[PDB]
Amino acid sequence: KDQEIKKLVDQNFKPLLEKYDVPGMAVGVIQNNKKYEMYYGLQSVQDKKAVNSNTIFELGSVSKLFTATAGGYAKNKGKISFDDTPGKYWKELKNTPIDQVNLLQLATYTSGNLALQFPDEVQTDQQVLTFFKDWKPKNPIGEYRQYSNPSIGLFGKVVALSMNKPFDQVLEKTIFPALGLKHSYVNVPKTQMQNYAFGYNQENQPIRVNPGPLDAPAYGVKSTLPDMLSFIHANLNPQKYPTDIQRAINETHQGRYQVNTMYQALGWEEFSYPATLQTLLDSNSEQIVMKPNKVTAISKEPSVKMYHKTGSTSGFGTYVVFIPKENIGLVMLTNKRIPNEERIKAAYVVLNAIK
Numbered sequence: 140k141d142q143e144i145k146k147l148v149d150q151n152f153k154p155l156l157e158k159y160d161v162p163g164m165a166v167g168v169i170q171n172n173k174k175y176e177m178y179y180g181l182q183s184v185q186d187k188k189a190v191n192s193n194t195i196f197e198l199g200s201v202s203k204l205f206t207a208t209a210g211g212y213a214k215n216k217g218k219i220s221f222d223d224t225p226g227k228y229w230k231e232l233k234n235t236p237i238d239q240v241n242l243l244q245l246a247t248y249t250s251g252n253l254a255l256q257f258p259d260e261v262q263t264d265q266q267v268l269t270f271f272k273d274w275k276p277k278n279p280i281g282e283y284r285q286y287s288n289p290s291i292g293l294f295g296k297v298v299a300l301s302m303n304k305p306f307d308q309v310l311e312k313t314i315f316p317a318l319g320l321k322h323s324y325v326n327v328p329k330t331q332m333q334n335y336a337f338g339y340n341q342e343n344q345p346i347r348v349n350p351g352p353l354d355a356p357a358y359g360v361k362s363t364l365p366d367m368l369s370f371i372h373a374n375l376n377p378q379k380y381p382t383d384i385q386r387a388i389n390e391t392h393q394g395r396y397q398v399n400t401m402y403q404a405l406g407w408e409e410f411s412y413p414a415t416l417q418t419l420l421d422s423n424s425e426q427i428v429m430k431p432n433k434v435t436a437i438s439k440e441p442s443v444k445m446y447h448k449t450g451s452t453s454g455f456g457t458y459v460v461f462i463p464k465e466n467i468g469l470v471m472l473t474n475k476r477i478p479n480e481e482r483i484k485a486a487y488v489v490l491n492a493i494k
């Protein structure tokens with residue numbers, strides 16, 4: 140029956156390459172502790188270099204899952220509390236209005252006045268500090284979700300301060316090794332540059348992500364399909380992992396609040412399983428992703444849960460999804476963006492057909 144996984148992935152993912160003119164794709168499934176890796180197309184059109192198990196892709200927003208894990212790790216080590224405010228760690232923010240927002244509210248986008256992106260003019264360390272010092276509340280703190288790079292970027296910066304190391308080193312020296320990841324990076328080293336895919340924009344031009352303010356915690360991790368399968372494996376089966384990372388992983392699975400059928404965990408989106416296709420698609424609707432939404436307390440605590448997260452950079456699309464009770468998960472990495480709905484639907488069909 141496992142002979143069907145390749146066929147399902149071919150039926151559901153492979154057509155997206157032609158449909159969206161995507162040069163390269165890697166799709167992985169993990170089921171019952173067995174990994175299946177499917178590679179398509181080219182990591183570099185100009186070089187005619189094939190996608191394979193060494194290919195490094197930009198994860199975009201899926202990077203937020205690592206930030207959340209790093210936060211869970213620091214919390215379980217006693218380095219932070221989710222009730223603390225940023226000013227406890229970034230001294231220059233002490234006694235400023237942003238110092239009334241707690242770390243959980245930053246991590247889960249509920250400061251009430253932070254948009255998807257910083258302003259284009261905000262670039263340097265100094266401009267970032269100033270942005271946060273000048274910050275003033277809008278909506279009541281904790282009450283409205285607006286998905287935000289700055290919000291979780293500040294979260295990540297505070298996590299790093301609490302661990303007395305720059306955020307890149309928190310991931311590369313502490314979190315990635317604890318997860319057993321061998322080719323995951325904030326900064327891809329010279330010795331791996333040959334493995335780094337080009338991304339391709341909507342005009343099919345090769346592109347890679349540009350440096351930006353607090354980029355690393357928001358959208359700055361790069362990884363391979365095998366490493367992302369290992370990450371899903373850790374999420375499905377944390378028992379094998381060191382206690383510290385185990386608690387960190389568990390921390391990311393805890394739903395914090397609800398927006399109808401979408402529960403916001405740390406980094407991860409959470410849903411009741413089984414979830415309808417429309418539930419999973421609407422989690423990435425314009426309304427949820429781009430606009431403020433007033434949240435509620437979790438009322439229905441799902442007995443059986445599933446989690447997902449999309450990610451995009453200019454030249455790359457990512458989707459990761461796992462379902463603990465079914466012991467299954469899927470990762471899709473492309474070096475061109477395709478609509479979220481296609482990613483989510485393809486994964487839905489595959490995981491349902493294997494279930």
Ligand SMILES: *[B@]([O])([C]N1[C]=C([C][N]S(=O)(=O)C2=[C][C]=C([C])[C]=[C]2)N=N1)OP([O])([O])=O
Nearest residue numbers: 199200201288358428449450451452453454
């Ligand atoms: B995260 O990666 C956060 N995220 C996504 C975006 C949209 N930028 S983009 O989709 O990469 C893009 C770049 C260039 C052009 C012309 C269009 C779109 N900004 N921050 O991803 P999600 O999936 O939204 O959670």
